[PDB]
Amino acid sequence: AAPGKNFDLSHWKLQLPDANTTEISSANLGLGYTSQYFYTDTDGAMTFWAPTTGGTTANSSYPRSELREMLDPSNSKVNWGWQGTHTMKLSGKTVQLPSSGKIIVAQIHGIMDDGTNAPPLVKAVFQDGQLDMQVKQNSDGTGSDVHNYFTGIKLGDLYNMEIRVTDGVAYVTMNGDTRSVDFVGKDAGWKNLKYYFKAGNYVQDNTSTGGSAIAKLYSLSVSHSNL
Question: Which of 124, 106, 141, 118 is nearest to 195 (CA)?
């Protein structure tokens, strides 16, 4: 069955790497959308394929086949804040890499209150042998990232990932190994942004002959909670 039947995609939309970077609505995912970019493989995985020459969204140079969390499937401007607990769990694997050897398989992305773009906060960067959960230091265009390296994560291996924000602290986990970064403690300006999760295949190669990447998910959930 197409992915939106094996997964609760009622609060995700899908962003594609076709030339026009088409988006597929939550409802259409639920009605069984499938294509070369997004399909159920024979192992049941929700599978994301994107070529390095794909279209790029307005503020990126890299192509993606990637889910974008929609608290309101009819309004992408409704997103969550730094206070309380916000947790994504997934299990998946990276099957094929582009020539650069690097893709992003999950994110927490910032966004302004009015919906305008803001920086990523967490980027789960996969390479064949290490995943780096990168946490951006500052909410604006300054500074760099805090790296968090997980050694031994290879191409084709299954990973169990969790990314949690509780009260302005990011907890980044692979296979039960959790690291943390207090992002509001680094820059209180993160309190002036909202956030949404992403998961899929954001290919860090835009070159002519870099080929394409495949990432898979076997489970994907989001929980927002309080006390």
Answer: 118
